[PDB]
Design an enzyme around this catalytic site. Sequence first.
Site, PDB file in Angstrom:
ATOM      1  N   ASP A 153       0.616  -1.621   0.008  1.00  0.00           N
ATOM      2  CA  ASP A 153       0.206   0.145  -0.162  1.00  0.00           C
ATOM      3  C   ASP A 153       0.975   1.238   0.196  1.00  0.00           C
ATOM      4  O   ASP A 153       1.818   1.291   0.363  1.00  0.00           O
ATOM      5  CB  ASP A 153      -0.919  -0.266   1.283  1.00  0.00           C
ATOM      6  CG  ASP A 153      -0.753   0.168   2.253  1.00  0.00           C
ATOM      7  OD1 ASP A 153       0.674  -0.270   2.454  1.00  0.00           O
ATOM      8  OD2 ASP A 153      -1.824   0.457   3.361  1.00  0.00           O
ATOM      9  N   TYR A 194       2.871   4.591   0.946  1.00  0.00           N
ATOM     10  CA  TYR A 194       3.642   5.118   2.092  1.00  0.00           C
ATOM     11  C   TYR A 194       3.087   6.306   2.934  1.00  0.00           C
ATOM     12  O   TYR A 194       2.109   6.610   1.984  1.00  0.00           O
ATOM     13  CB  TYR A 194       4.794   5.920   1.227  1.00  0.00           C
ATOM     14  CG  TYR A 194       6.324   5.591   0.789  1.00  0.00           C
ATOM     15  CD1 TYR A 194       6.628   4.006   1.686  1.00  0.00           C
ATOM     16  CD2 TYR A 194       6.525   5.427  -0.076  1.00  0.00           C
ATOM     17  CE1 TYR A 194       7.644   3.454   0.846  1.00  0.00           C
ATOM     18  CE2 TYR A 194       7.037   5.010  -0.965  1.00  0.00           C
ATOM     19  CZ  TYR A 194       7.824   3.425  -0.512  1.00  0.00           C
ATOM     20  OH  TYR A 194       9.159   2.670  -0.613  1.00  0.00           O
ATOM     21  N   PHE A 216       6.417   2.121  -4.599  1.00  0.00           N
ATOM     22  CA  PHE A 216       7.878   2.451  -4.147  1.00  0.00           C
ATOM     23  C   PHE A 216       8.914   3.671  -4.240  1.00  0.00           C
ATOM     24  O   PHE A 216       9.534   4.188  -3.454  1.00  0.00           O
ATOM     25  CB  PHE A 216       9.533   1.053  -4.489  1.00  0.00           C
ATOM     26  CG  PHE A 216       8.440  -0.539  -4.735  1.00  0.00           C
ATOM     27  CD1 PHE A 216       8.899  -0.454  -3.598  1.00  0.00           C
ATOM     28  CD2 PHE A 216       7.841  -0.865  -5.402  1.00  0.00           C
ATOM     29  CE1 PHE A 216       9.144  -2.095  -2.904  1.00  0.00           C
ATOM     30  CE2 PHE A 216       7.555  -2.316  -4.200  1.00  0.00           C
ATOM     31  CZ  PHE A 216       8.335  -2.875  -4.005  1.00  0.00           C
ATOM     32  N   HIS A 219      11.568  -9.402  -0.415  1.00  0.00           N
ATOM     33  CA  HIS A 219      11.306  -8.335  -0.268  1.00  0.00           C
ATOM     34  C   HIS A 219      11.901  -7.422  -0.028  1.00  0.00           C
ATOM     35  O   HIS A 219      13.245  -7.867   0.889  1.00  0.00           O
ATOM     36  CB  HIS A 219      10.059  -7.801   0.594  1.00  0.00           C
ATOM     37  CG  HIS A 219       9.429  -6.714   0.604  1.00  0.00           C
ATOM     38  ND1 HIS A 219       9.650  -5.610   1.068  1.00  0.00           N
ATOM     39  CD2 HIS A 219       8.175  -6.164  -0.582  1.00  0.00           C
ATOM     40  CE1 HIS A 219       9.200  -4.002   0.703  1.00  0.00           C
ATOM     41  NE2 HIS A 219       8.001  -4.818  -0.414  1.00  0.00           N
TER      42      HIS A 219
END
Lengths: 230, 4
Positions: free
Chosen positions: A67, A69, A80, A190
Amino acid sequence: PIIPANLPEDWQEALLPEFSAPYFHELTDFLRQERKEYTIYPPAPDVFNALRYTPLGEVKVLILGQDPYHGPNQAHGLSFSVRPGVRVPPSLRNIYKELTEDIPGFVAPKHGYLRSWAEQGVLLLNAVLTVRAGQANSHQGKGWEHFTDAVIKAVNAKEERVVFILWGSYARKKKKLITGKNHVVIESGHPSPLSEQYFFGTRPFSKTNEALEKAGRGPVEWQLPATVTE
Amino acid sequence: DLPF
Protein backbone atom coordinates in the site's frame (compact mmCIF):
# COMPACT_ATOMS: atom_id res chain seq x y z
CA PRO A 1 -19.93 3.91 -13.47
CA ILE A 2 -17.67 6.06 -11.22
CA ILE A 3 -14.82 7.04 -13.54
CA PRO A 4 -11.75 8.97 -12.25
CA ALA A 5 -10.43 11.99 -14.16
CA ASN A 6 -7.65 11.91 -16.74
CA LEU A 7 -7.37 8.12 -17.13
CA PRO A 8 -6.00 6.58 -20.34
CA GLU A 9 -8.82 5.21 -22.53
CA ASP A 10 -7.49 1.66 -22.57
CA TRP A 11 -7.66 1.57 -18.72
CA GLN A 12 -11.16 3.09 -18.75
CA GLU A 13 -12.26 0.33 -21.11
CA ALA A 14 -10.49 -2.51 -19.29
CA LEU A 15 -11.59 -1.44 -15.81
CA LEU A 16 -15.18 -0.28 -16.54
CA PRO A 17 -16.54 -3.42 -14.74
CA GLU A 18 -14.77 -2.31 -11.54
CA PHE A 19 -15.80 1.35 -11.90
CA SER A 20 -19.44 0.17 -12.32
CA ALA A 21 -19.41 -2.40 -9.44
CA PRO A 22 -21.58 -1.97 -6.31
CA TYR A 23 -18.48 -2.63 -4.08
CA PHE A 24 -16.64 0.26 -5.81
CA HIS A 25 -19.59 2.63 -5.15
CA GLU A 26 -19.30 1.70 -1.54
CA LEU A 27 -15.51 2.13 -1.57
CA THR A 28 -16.03 5.62 -3.05
CA ASP A 29 -18.37 6.58 -0.17
CA PHE A 30 -15.99 5.21 2.38
CA LEU A 31 -13.06 7.26 0.96
CA ARG A 32 -15.15 10.47 0.76
CA GLN A 33 -15.86 10.13 4.46
CA GLU A 34 -12.27 9.06 5.25
CA ARG A 35 -10.87 12.23 3.66
CA LYS A 36 -13.13 14.31 5.96
CA GLU A 37 -12.07 12.56 9.17
CA TYR A 38 -8.39 11.93 8.40
CA THR A 39 -5.47 12.88 6.20
CA ILE A 40 -5.52 10.18 3.45
CA TYR A 41 -2.51 9.35 1.27
CA PRO A 42 -1.91 9.87 -1.49
CA PRO A 43 -3.88 13.06 -2.22
CA ALA A 44 -7.00 12.42 -4.35
CA PRO A 45 -5.55 13.61 -7.69
CA ASP A 46 -2.58 11.20 -7.30
CA VAL A 47 -4.44 7.99 -6.42
CA PHE A 48 -4.39 6.74 -10.02
CA ASN A 49 -0.98 8.06 -11.18
CA ALA A 50 0.42 4.57 -11.99
CA LEU A 51 -2.33 4.02 -14.59
CA ARG A 52 -1.91 7.55 -16.05
CA TYR A 53 1.86 7.33 -16.50
CA THR A 54 1.69 3.78 -17.88
CA PRO A 55 -1.34 3.13 -20.18
CA LEU A 56 -2.37 -0.53 -20.46
CA GLY A 57 -1.02 -0.66 -24.01
CA GLU A 58 2.39 0.52 -22.78
CA VAL A 59 2.79 -2.00 -19.91
CA LYS A 60 6.07 -3.96 -20.24
CA VAL A 61 6.81 -4.56 -16.48
CA LEU A 62 4.66 -4.69 -13.39
CA ILE A 63 6.19 -4.04 -9.94
CA LEU A 64 3.63 -4.71 -7.26
CA GLY A 65 3.81 -2.93 -3.87
CA GLN A 66 1.40 -3.40 -0.92
CA ASP A 67 0.00 0.00 0.00
CA PRO A 68 1.06 3.62 -0.21
CA TYR A 69 3.65 5.15 2.07
CA HIS A 70 1.74 6.69 5.05
CA GLY A 71 4.01 9.55 6.14
CA PRO A 72 3.78 13.16 4.96
CA ASN A 73 4.87 13.91 1.36
CA GLN A 74 5.86 10.30 0.61
CA ALA A 75 3.20 8.61 -1.53
CA HIS A 76 2.25 9.98 -4.91
CA GLY A 77 0.42 7.09 -6.61
CA LEU A 78 3.35 4.82 -7.60
CA SER A 79 4.59 1.75 -5.75
CA PHE A 80 8.01 2.23 -4.01
CA SER A 81 8.49 5.81 -5.26
CA VAL A 82 8.54 9.04 -3.18
CA ARG A 83 8.22 12.72 -4.21
CA PRO A 84 11.41 14.72 -4.96
CA GLY A 85 12.95 16.23 -1.82
CA VAL A 86 11.77 13.36 0.40
CA ARG A 87 14.24 10.98 2.07
CA VAL A 88 14.59 7.70 0.20
CA PRO A 89 12.77 5.10 2.38
CA PRO A 90 14.61 1.88 3.44
CA SER A 91 13.09 -0.52 0.81
CA LEU A 92 13.94 1.95 -2.01
CA ARG A 93 17.48 2.38 -0.62
CA ASN A 94 17.87 -1.39 -0.90
CA ILE A 95 16.39 -1.36 -4.42
CA TYR A 96 19.08 1.31 -5.32
CA LYS A 97 21.80 -0.88 -3.80
CA GLU A 98 20.69 -3.89 -5.86
CA LEU A 99 20.45 -1.69 -9.03
CA THR A 100 24.02 -0.48 -8.37
CA GLU A 101 25.23 -4.12 -8.31
CA ASP A 102 23.00 -5.40 -11.09
CA ILE A 103 23.05 -2.65 -13.80
CA PRO A 104 26.57 -1.66 -14.96
CA GLY A 105 27.10 2.07 -14.59
CA PHE A 106 23.92 2.61 -12.56
CA VAL A 107 24.39 5.52 -10.14
CA ALA A 108 21.81 5.93 -7.39
CA PRO A 109 20.35 9.44 -7.44
CA LYS A 110 19.75 11.62 -4.34
CA HIS A 111 15.95 11.46 -4.81
CA GLY A 112 13.39 8.59 -4.69
CA TYR A 113 11.19 9.62 -7.61
CA LEU A 114 10.51 6.80 -10.09
CA ARG A 115 8.33 8.60 -12.61
CA SER A 116 10.83 7.99 -15.41
CA TRP A 117 10.43 4.21 -14.98
CA ALA A 118 6.64 4.55 -15.22
CA GLU A 119 7.04 6.60 -18.41
CA GLN A 120 8.80 3.73 -20.17
CA GLY A 121 6.29 1.04 -19.46
CA VAL A 122 6.89 0.08 -15.83
CA LEU A 123 3.54 -0.13 -14.10
CA LEU A 124 4.26 0.75 -10.45
CA LEU A 125 1.13 -0.74 -8.93
CA ASN A 126 0.27 -0.84 -5.20
CA ALA A 127 -2.30 -3.60 -4.28
CA VAL A 128 -4.04 -1.03 -2.06
CA LEU A 129 -4.24 2.50 -3.41
CA THR A 130 -5.03 4.62 -0.32
CA VAL A 131 -4.01 4.70 3.39
CA ARG A 132 -4.74 6.78 6.51
CA ALA A 133 -1.78 8.97 7.52
CA GLY A 134 0.41 7.02 9.96
CA GLN A 135 -1.65 3.77 9.92
CA ALA A 136 -0.34 1.08 7.51
CA ASN A 137 -2.99 -1.40 6.16
CA SER A 138 -5.76 0.88 7.38
CA HIS A 139 -7.57 0.53 4.01
CA GLN A 140 -6.93 -3.19 3.53
CA GLY A 141 -9.96 -5.24 2.26
CA LYS A 142 -12.12 -2.22 1.33
CA GLY A 143 -12.13 -3.01 -2.37
CA TRP A 144 -8.72 -1.88 -3.65
CA GLU A 145 -7.39 -5.47 -3.84
CA HIS A 146 -10.36 -6.49 -6.01
CA PHE A 147 -9.66 -3.43 -8.19
CA THR A 148 -5.88 -4.01 -8.51
CA ASP A 149 -6.30 -7.74 -9.18
CA ALA A 150 -8.49 -6.55 -12.08
CA VAL A 151 -5.54 -4.43 -13.23
CA ILE A 152 -3.21 -7.48 -12.97
CA LYS A 153 -5.72 -9.60 -14.90
CA ALA A 154 -6.06 -6.96 -17.66
CA VAL A 155 -2.26 -6.83 -17.98
CA ASN A 156 -2.03 -10.66 -17.99
CA ALA A 157 -4.65 -10.68 -20.77
CA LYS A 158 -2.16 -8.95 -23.11
CA GLU A 159 -0.48 -11.09 -25.73
CA GLU A 160 2.86 -9.22 -25.81
CA ARG A 161 5.28 -10.25 -23.00
CA VAL A 162 5.03 -8.50 -19.65
CA VAL A 163 7.52 -9.08 -16.84
CA PHE A 164 5.75 -9.26 -13.44
CA ILE A 165 8.19 -8.58 -10.58
CA LEU A 166 6.80 -10.08 -7.32
CA TRP A 167 8.71 -9.22 -4.18
CA GLY A 168 7.78 -10.84 -0.84
CA SER A 169 5.14 -13.35 0.30
CA TYR A 170 2.15 -11.14 -0.34
CA ALA A 171 3.00 -10.23 -3.97
CA ARG A 172 4.05 -13.79 -4.71
CA LYS A 173 0.47 -14.96 -4.10
CA LYS A 174 -0.41 -13.18 -7.43
CA LYS A 175 1.67 -15.64 -9.41
CA LYS A 176 -1.51 -17.74 -9.91
CA LEU A 177 -3.01 -14.88 -11.97
CA ILE A 178 -0.13 -14.89 -14.47
CA THR A 179 -1.32 -17.46 -17.00
CA GLY A 180 -0.44 -15.62 -20.24
CA LYS A 181 1.83 -17.75 -22.41
CA ASN A 182 4.32 -14.93 -23.13
CA HIS A 183 4.64 -13.49 -19.64
CA VAL A 184 7.50 -13.89 -17.21
CA VAL A 185 7.45 -13.83 -13.39
CA ILE A 186 10.49 -12.67 -11.49
CA GLU A 187 10.12 -13.46 -7.81
CA SER A 188 12.19 -13.05 -4.67
CA GLY A 189 12.14 -11.82 -1.08
CA HIS A 190 11.08 -8.26 -0.39
CA PRO A 191 13.70 -5.39 -0.39
CA SER A 192 12.50 -4.31 3.10
CA PRO A 193 15.30 -4.39 5.76
CA LEU A 194 13.23 -7.19 7.47
CA SER A 195 13.89 -9.57 4.58
CA GLU A 196 16.68 -7.89 2.56
CA GLN A 197 18.80 -11.12 2.68
CA TYR A 198 16.29 -12.75 0.30
CA PHE A 199 16.42 -9.71 -2.02
CA PHE A 200 20.16 -8.87 -2.43
CA GLY A 201 21.89 -10.57 -5.34
CA THR A 202 18.67 -11.64 -7.11
CA ARG A 203 19.35 -9.18 -10.02
CA PRO A 204 15.70 -8.68 -10.96
CA PHE A 205 16.52 -5.67 -13.24
CA SER A 206 18.97 -7.35 -15.62
CA LYS A 207 16.78 -10.48 -15.58
CA THR A 208 13.75 -8.35 -16.56
CA ASN A 209 15.79 -6.80 -19.39
CA GLU A 210 16.95 -10.18 -20.61
CA ALA A 211 13.34 -11.37 -20.81
CA LEU A 212 12.28 -8.19 -22.62
CA GLU A 213 15.23 -8.30 -25.09
CA LYS A 214 14.42 -11.94 -25.91
CA ALA A 215 10.86 -11.04 -26.72
CA GLY A 216 11.73 -7.96 -28.80
CA ARG A 217 9.95 -5.81 -26.23
CA GLY A 218 12.73 -3.30 -25.47
CA PRO A 219 14.81 -3.48 -22.26
CA VAL A 220 14.05 -0.77 -19.62
CA GLU A 221 16.53 2.06 -19.05
CA TRP A 222 16.82 1.71 -15.25
CA GLN A 223 19.07 4.71 -14.78
CA LEU A 224 17.20 7.55 -13.11
CA PRO A 225 17.83 11.25 -13.83
CA ALA A 226 20.17 12.84 -11.31
CA THR A 227 17.63 15.58 -10.44
CA VAL A 228 13.87 15.74 -11.12
CA THR A 229 10.72 17.93 -11.57
CA GLU A 230 7.10 17.02 -10.80
CA ASP B 1 -16.06 15.62 -5.42
CA LEU B 2 -14.25 12.28 -6.10
CA PRO B 3 -11.73 11.04 -3.46
CA PHE B 4 -9.50 9.65 -6.30
